[PDB]
Coordinates of N, CA and C and ligand atoms in Angstrom, one line a residue:
X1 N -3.7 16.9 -9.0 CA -5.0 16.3 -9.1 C -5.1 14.9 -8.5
X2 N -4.7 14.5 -7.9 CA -4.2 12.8 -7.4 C -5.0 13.4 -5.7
X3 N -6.1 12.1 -5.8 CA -6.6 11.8 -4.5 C -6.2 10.5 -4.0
X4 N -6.3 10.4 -2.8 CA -5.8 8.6 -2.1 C -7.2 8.1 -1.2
X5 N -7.6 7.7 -1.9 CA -9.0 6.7 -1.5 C -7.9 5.7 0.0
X6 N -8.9 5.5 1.2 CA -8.2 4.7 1.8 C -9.4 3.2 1.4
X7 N -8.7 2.4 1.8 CA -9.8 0.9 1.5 C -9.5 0.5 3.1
X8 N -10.9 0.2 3.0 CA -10.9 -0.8 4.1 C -10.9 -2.4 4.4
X9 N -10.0 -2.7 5.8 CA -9.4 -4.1 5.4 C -10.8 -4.6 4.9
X10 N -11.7 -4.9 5.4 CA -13.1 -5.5 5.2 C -13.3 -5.8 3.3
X11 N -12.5 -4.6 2.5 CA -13.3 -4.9 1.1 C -12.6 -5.8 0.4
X12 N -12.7 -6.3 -0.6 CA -12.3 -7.5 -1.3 C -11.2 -7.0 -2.0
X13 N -10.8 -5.5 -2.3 CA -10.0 -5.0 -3.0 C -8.4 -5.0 -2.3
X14 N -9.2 -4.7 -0.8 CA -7.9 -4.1 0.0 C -7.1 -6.0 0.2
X15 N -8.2 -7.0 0.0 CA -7.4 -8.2 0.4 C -6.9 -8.9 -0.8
X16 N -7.3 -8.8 -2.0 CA -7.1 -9.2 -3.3 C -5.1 -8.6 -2.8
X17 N -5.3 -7.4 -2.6 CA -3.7 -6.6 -3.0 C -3.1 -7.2 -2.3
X18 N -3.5 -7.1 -0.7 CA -2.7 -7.9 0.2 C -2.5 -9.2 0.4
X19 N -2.7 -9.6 -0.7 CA -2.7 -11.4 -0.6 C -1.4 -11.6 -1.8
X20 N -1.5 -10.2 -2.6 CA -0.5 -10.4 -4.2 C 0.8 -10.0 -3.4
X21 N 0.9 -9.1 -2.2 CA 2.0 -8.6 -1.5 C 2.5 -9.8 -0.7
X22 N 2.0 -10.5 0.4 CA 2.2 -11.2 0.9 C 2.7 -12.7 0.5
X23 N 1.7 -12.9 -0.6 CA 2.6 -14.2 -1.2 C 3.5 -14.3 -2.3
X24 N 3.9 -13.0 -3.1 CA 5.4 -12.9 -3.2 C 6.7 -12.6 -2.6
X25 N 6.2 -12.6 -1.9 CA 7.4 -12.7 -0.8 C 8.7 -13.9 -0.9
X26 N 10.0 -13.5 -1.3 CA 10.8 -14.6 -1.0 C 12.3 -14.5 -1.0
X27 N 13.2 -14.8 -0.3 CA 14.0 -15.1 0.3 C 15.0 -14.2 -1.2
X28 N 15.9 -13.8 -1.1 CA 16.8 -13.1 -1.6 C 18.1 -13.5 -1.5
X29 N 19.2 -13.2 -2.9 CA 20.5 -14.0 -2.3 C 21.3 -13.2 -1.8
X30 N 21.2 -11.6 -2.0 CA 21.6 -11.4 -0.5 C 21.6 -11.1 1.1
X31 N 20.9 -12.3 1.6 CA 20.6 -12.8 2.6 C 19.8 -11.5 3.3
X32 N 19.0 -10.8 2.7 CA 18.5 -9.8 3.3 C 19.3 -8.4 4.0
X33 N 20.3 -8.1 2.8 CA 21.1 -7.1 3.3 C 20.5 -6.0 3.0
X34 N 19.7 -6.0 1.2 CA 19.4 -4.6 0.5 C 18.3 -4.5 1.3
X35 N 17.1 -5.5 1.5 CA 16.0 -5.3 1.8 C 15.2 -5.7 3.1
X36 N 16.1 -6.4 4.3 CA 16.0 -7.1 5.5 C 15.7 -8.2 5.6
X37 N 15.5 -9.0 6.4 CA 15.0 -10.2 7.1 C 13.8 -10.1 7.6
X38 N 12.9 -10.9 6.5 CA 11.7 -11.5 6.7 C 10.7 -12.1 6.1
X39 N 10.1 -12.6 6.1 CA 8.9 -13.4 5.5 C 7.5 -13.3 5.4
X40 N 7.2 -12.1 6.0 CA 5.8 -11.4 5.4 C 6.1 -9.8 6.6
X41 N 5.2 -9.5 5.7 CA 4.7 -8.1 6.3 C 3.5 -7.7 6.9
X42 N 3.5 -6.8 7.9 CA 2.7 -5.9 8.7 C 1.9 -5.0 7.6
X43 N 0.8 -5.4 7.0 CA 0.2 -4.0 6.0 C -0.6 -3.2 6.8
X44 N -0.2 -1.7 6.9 CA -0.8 -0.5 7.7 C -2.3 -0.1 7.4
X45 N -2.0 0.1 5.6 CA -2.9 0.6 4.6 C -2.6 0.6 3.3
X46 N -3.7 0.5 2.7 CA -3.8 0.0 1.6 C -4.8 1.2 0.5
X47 N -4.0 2.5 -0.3 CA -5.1 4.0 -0.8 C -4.7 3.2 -2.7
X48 N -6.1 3.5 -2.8 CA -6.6 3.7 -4.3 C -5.7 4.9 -4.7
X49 N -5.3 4.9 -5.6 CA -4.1 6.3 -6.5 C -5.5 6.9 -7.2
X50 N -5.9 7.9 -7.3 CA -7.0 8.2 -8.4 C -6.2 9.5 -8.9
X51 N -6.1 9.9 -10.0 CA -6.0 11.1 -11.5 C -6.5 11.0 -12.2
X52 N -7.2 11.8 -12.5 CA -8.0 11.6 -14.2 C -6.9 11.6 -15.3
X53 N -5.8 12.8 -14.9 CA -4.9 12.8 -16.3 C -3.9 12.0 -16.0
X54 N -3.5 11.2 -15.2 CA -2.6 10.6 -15.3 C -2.8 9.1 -15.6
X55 N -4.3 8.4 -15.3 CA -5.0 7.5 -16.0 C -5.7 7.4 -17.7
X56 N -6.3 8.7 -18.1 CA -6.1 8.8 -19.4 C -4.8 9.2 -20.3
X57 N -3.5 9.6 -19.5 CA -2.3 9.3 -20.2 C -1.9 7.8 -19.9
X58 N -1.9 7.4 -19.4 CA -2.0 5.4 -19.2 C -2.6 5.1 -20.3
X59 N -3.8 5.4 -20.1 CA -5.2 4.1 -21.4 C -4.5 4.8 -23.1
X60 N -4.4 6.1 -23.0 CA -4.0 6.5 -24.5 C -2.6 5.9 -24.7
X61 N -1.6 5.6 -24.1 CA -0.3 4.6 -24.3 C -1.1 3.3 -24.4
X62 N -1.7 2.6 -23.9 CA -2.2 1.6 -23.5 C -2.7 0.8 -25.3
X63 N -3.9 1.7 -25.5 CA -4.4 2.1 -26.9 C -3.1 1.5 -28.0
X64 N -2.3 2.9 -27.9 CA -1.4 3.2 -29.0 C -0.4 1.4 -29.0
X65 N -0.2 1.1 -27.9 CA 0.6 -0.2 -27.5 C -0.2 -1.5 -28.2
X66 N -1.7 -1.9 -27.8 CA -2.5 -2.6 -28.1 C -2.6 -2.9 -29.7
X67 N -2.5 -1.6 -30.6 CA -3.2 -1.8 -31.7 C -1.6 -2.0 -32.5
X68 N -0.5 -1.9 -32.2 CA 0.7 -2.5 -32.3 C 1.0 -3.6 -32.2
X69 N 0.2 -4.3 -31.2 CA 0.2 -5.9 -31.0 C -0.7 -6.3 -31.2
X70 N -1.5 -6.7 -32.2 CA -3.3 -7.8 -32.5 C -4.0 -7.1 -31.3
X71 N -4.2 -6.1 -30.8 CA -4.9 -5.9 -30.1 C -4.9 -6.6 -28.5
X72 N -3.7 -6.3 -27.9 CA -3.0 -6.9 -26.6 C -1.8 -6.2 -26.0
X73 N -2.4 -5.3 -25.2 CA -1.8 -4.6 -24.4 C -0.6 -5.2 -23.3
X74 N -0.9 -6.5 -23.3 CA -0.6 -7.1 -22.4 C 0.1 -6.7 -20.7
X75 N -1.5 -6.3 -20.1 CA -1.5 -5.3 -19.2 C -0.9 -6.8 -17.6
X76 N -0.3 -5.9 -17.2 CA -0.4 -6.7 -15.9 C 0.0 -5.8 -14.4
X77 N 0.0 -6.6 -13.1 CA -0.1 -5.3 -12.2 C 1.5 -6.0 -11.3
X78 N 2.1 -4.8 -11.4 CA 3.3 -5.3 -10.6 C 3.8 -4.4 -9.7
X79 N 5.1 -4.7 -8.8 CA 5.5 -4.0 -8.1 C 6.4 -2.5 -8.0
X80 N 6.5 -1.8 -7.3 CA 7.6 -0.8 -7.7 C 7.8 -0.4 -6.0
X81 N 9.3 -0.3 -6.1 CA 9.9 0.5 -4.9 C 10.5 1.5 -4.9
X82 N 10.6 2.5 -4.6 CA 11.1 4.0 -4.9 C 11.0 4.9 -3.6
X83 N 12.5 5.4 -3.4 CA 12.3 6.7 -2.7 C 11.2 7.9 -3.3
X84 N 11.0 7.8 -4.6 CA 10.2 9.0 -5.3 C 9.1 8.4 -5.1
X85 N 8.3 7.3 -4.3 CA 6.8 7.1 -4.2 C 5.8 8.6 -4.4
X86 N 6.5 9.3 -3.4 CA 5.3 10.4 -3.7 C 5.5 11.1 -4.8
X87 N 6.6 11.6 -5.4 CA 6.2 12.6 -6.9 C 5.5 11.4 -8.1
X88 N 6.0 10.2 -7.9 CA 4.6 9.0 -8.6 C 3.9 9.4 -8.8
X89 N 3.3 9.2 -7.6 CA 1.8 9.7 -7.1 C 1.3 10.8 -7.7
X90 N 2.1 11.8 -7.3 CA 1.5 13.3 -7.6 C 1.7 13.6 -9.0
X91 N 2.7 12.9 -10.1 CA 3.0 13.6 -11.5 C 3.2 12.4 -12.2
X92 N 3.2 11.2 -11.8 CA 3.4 10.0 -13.2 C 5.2 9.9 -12.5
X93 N 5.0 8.3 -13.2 CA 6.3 8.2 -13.8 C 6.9 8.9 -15.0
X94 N 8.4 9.1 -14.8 CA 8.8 9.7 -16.2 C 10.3 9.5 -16.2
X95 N 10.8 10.0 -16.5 CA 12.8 9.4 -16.9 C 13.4 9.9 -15.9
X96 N 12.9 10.9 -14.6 CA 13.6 11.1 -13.4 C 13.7 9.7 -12.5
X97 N 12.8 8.6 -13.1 CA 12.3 7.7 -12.5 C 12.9 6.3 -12.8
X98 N 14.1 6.4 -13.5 CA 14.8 5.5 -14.6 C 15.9 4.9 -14.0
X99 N 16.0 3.2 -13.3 CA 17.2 2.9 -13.2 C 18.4 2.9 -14.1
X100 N 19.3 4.1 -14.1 CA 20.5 4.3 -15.1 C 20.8 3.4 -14.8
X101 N 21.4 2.8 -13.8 CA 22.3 1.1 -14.1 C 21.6 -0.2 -13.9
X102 N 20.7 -0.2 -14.1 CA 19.6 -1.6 -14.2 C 20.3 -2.1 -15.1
X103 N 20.1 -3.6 -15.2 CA 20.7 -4.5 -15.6 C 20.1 -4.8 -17.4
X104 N 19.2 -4.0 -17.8 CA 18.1 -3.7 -18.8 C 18.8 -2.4 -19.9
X105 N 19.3 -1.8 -19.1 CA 19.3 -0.6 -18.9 C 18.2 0.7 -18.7
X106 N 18.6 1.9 -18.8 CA 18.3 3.2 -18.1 C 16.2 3.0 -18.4
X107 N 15.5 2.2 -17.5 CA 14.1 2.7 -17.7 C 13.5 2.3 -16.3
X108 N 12.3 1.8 -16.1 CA 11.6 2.1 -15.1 C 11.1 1.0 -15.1
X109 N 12.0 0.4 -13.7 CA 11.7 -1.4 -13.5 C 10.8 -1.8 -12.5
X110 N 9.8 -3.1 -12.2 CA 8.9 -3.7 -11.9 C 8.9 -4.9 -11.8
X111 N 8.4 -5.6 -10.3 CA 8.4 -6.9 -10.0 C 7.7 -7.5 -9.5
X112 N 7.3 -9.0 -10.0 CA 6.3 -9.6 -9.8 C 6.7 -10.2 -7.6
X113 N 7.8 -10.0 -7.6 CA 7.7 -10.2 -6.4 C 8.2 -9.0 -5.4
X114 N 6.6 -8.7 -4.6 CA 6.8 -7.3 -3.9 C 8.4 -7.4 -2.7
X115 N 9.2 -8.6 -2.5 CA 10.2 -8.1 -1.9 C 11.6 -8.2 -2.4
X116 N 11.1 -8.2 -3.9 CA 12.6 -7.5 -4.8 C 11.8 -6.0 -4.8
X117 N 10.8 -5.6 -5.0 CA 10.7 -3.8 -4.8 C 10.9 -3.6 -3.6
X118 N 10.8 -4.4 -2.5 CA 10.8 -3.6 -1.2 C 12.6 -3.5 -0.8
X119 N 13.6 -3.8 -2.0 CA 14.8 -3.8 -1.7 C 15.2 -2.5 -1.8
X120 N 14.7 -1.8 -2.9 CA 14.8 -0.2 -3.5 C 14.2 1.0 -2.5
X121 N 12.9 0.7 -1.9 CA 12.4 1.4 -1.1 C 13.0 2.8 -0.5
X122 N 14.3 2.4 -0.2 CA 15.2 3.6 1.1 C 16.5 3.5 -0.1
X123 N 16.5 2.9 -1.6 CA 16.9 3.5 -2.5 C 17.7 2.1 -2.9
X124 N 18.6 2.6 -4.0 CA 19.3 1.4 -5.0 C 20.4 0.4 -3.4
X125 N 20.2 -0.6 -4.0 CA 20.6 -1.6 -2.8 C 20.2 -1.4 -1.2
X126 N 19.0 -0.9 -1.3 CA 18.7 -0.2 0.0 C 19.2 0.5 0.4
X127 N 20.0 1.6 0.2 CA 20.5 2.6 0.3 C 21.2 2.3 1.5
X128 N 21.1 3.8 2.7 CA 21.3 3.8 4.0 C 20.5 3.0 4.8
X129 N 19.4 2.5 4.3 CA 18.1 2.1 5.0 C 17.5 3.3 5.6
X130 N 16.7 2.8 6.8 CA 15.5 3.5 6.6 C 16.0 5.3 7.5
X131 N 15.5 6.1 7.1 CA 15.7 7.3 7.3 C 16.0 8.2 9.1
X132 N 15.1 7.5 10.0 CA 15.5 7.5 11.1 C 16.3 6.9 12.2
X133 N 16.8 5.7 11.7 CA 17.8 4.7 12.4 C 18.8 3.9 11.3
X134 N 18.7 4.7 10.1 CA 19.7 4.0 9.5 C 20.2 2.5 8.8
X135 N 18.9 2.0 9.0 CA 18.8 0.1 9.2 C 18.4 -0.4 8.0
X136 N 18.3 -1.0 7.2 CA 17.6 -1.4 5.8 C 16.9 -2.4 6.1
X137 N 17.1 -3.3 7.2 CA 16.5 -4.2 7.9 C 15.6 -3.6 8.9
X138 N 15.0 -2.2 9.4 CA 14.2 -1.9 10.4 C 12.6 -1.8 10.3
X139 N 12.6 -2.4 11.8 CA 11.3 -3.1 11.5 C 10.1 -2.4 11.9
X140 N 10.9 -1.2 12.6 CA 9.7 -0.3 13.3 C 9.2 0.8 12.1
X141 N 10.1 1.1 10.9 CA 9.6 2.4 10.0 C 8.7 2.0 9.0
X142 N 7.7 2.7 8.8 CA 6.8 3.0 8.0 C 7.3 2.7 6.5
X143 N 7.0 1.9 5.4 CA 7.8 1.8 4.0 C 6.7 1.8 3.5
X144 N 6.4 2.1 1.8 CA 5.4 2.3 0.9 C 6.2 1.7 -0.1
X145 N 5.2 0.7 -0.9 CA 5.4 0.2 -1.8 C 4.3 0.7 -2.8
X146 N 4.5 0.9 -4.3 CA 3.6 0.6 -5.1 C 3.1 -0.5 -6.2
X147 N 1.9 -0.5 -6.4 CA 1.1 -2.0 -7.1 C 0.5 -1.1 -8.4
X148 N 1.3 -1.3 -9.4 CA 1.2 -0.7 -10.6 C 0.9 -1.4 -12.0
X149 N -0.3 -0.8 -12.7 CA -0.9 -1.6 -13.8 C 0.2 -0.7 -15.1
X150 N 0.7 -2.2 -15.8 CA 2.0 -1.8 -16.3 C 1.5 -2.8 -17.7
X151 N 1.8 -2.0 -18.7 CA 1.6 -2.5 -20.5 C 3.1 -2.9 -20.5
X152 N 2.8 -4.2 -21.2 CA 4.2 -4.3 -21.4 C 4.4 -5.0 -23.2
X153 N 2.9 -4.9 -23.5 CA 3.1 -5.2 -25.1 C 4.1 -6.0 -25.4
X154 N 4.4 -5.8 -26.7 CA 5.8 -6.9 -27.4 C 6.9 -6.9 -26.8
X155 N 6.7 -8.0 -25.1 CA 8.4 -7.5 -24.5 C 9.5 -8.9 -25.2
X156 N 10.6 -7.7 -25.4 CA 11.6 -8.5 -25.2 C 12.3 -9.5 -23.6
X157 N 12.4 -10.6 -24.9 CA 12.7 -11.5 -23.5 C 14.2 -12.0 -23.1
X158 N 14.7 -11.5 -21.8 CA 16.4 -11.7 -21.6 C 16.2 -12.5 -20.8
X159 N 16.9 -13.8 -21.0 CA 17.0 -14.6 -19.6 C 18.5 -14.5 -18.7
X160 N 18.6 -14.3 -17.6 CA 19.2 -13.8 -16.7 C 19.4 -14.5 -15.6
X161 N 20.6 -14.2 -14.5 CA 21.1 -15.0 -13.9 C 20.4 -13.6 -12.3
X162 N 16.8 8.3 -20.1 CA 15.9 7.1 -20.6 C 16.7 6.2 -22.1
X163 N 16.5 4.8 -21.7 CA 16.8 4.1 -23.3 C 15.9 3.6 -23.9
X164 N 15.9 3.0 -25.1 CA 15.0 2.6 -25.8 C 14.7 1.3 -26.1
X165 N 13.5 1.2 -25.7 CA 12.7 -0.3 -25.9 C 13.8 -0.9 -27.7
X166 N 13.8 -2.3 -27.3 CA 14.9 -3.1 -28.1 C 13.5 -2.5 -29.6
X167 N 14.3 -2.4 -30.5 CA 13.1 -2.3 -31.6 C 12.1 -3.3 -31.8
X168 N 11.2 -2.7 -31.7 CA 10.1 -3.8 -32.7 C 9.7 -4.3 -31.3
X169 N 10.0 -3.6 -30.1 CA 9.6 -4.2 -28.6 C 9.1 -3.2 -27.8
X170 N 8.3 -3.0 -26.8 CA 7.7 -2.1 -25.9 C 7.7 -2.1 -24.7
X171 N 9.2 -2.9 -24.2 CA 9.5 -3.7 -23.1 C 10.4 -4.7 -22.7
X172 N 11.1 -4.9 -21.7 CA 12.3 -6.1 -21.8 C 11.5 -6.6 -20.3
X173 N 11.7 -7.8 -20.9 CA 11.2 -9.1 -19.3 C 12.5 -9.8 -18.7
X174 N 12.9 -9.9 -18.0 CA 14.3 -10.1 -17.2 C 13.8 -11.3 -16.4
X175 N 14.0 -12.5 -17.7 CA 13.7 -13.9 -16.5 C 14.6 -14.4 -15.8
X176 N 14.1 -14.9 -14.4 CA 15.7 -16.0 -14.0 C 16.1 -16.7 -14.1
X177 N 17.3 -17.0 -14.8 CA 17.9 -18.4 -15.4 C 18.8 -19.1 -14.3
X178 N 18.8 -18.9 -13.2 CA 19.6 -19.2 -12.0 C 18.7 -19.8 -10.8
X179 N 18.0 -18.9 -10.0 CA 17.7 -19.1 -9.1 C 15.7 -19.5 -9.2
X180 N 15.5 -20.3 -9.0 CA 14.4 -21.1 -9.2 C 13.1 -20.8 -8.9
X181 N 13.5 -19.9 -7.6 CA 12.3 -19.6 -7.0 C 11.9 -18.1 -7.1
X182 N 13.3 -17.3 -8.5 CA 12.9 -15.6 -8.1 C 11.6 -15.4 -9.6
X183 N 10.7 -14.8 -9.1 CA 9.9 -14.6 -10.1 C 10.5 -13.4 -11.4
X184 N 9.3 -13.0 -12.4 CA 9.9 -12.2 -13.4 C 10.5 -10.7 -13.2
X185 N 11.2 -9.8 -13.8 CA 11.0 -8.4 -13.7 C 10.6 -7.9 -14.8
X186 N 10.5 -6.5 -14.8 CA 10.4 -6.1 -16.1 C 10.7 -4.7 -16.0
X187 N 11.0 -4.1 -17.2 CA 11.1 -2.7 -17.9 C 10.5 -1.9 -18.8
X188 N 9.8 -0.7 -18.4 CA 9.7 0.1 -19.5 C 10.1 1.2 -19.8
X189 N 10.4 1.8 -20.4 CA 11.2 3.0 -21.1 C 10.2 4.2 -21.4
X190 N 8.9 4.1 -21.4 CA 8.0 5.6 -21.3 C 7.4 5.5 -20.1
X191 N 7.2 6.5 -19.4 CA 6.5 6.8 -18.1 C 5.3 6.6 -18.1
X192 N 4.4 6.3 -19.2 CA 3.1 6.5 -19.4 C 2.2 5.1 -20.0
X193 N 3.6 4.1 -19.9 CA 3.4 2.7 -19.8 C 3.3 2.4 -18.6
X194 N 3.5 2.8 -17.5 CA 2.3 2.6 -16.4 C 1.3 3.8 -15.2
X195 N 0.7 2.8 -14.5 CA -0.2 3.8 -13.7 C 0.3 3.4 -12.5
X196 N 0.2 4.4 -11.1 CA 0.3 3.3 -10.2 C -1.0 4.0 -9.1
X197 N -1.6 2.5 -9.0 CA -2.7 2.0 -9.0 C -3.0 2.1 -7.2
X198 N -2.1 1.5 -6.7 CA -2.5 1.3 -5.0 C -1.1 1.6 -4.2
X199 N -1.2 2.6 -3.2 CA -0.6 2.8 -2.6 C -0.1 1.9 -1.2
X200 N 0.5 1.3 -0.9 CA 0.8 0.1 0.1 C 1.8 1.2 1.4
X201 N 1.2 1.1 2.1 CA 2.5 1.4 3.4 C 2.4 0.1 4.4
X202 N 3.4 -0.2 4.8 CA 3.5 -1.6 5.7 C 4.9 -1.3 6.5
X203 N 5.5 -2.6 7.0 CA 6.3 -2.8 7.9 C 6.8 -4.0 7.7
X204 N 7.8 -4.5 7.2 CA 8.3 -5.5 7.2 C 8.4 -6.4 9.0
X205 N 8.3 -7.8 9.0 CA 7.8 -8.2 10.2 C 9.5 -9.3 10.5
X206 N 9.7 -9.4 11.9 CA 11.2 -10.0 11.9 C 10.4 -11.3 12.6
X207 N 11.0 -12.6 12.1 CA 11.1 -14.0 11.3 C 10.6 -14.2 13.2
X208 N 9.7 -15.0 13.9 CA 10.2 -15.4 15.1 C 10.7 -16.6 15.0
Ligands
WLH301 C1 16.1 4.8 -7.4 N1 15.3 3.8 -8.3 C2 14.1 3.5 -7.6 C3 13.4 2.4 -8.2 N2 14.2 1.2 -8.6 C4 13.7 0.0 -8.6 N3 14.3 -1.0 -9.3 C5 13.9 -2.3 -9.4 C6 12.7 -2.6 -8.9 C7 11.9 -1.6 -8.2 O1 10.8 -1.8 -7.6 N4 12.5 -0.3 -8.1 C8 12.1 -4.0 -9.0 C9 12.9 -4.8 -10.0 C10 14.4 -4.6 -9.7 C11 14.7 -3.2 -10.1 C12 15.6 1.6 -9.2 C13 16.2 2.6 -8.4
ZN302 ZN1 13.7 2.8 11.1

């Protein structure tokens, strides 16, 4: 049931996203090994995710989350990298989707800055990199990121250098206690604590 709306650069939507992609962007401490060398991206296109059941399984978690906290979902929209972008797309997140060794442990992590997700893209530490030349750094292949409206309710908070949300929490926030400039992450443990919302394909762009 999943359609892909394309947006065009012209609408305010397609530049709202590209402006949250673009200016999270930042420098990594490992010097761009997982995820390459660069400082902004090439955006190709920018598709609306539409499901009806996979959006009313969102708002009904959403609900269930809110009325657990004073009525505060505490919704926000963040990043995700994945070789599984498309079964996303087509079935939800769900525990096939779960970093086992995240630093959280085993659930389904998100970042406010789109180039800690664009590390995961071609897989955990960038894998092999990209599929046709092998590069993690290549600048010619096509990569999709997703921009995901994510509840994160009562998160527990770790500050920092499927399992179960810590009790009495619906979420772990992974702040950085080290490096000054990396923004938040976060985790959730049910698939149905987020949606993902815009499909991003781009091109990482090399520094002139
Ligand atoms: C194969 N998995 C795909 C998604 N993945 C992932 N992890 C993180 C992020 C991400 O976008 N994808 C952002 C925060 C850091 C952890 C874990 C590995
Ligand atoms: Zn390539």
């Amino acid at each position: 049931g999943t359609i892909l709306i394309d947006l065009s650069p012209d609408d305010k939507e397609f530049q709202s996203v590209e402006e949250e992609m673009q200016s999270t962007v930042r420098e990594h401490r490992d010097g761009g090994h997982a995820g390459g060398i660069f400082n902004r991206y090439n955006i190709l296109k920018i598709q609306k995710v539409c499901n009806k059941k996979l959006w009313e399984r969102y708002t009904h978690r959403r609900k269930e989350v809110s009325e657990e906290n004073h009525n505060h979902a505490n919704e926000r929209m963040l990043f995700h990298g994945s070789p599984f972008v498309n079964a996303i797309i087509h079935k939800g997140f769900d525990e096939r989707h779960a970093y086992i060794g995240g630093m959280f442990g085993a659930g389904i992590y998100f970042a406010e800055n789109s180039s800690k997700s664009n590390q995961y893209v071609y897989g955990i530490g960038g894998g092999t990199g990209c599929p046709v030349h092998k590069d993690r750094s290549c600048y010619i292949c096509h990569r999709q990121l997703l921009f995901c409206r994510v509840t994160l309710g009562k998160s527990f908070l770790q500050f920092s250098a499927m399992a179960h949300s810590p009790p009495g929490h619906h979420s772990v926030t992974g702040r950085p206690s080290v490096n000054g400039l990396a923004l938040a992450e976060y985790v959730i443990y049910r698939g149905e604590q987020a949606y993902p919302e815009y499909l991003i394909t781009y091109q990482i762009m090399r520094p002139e």
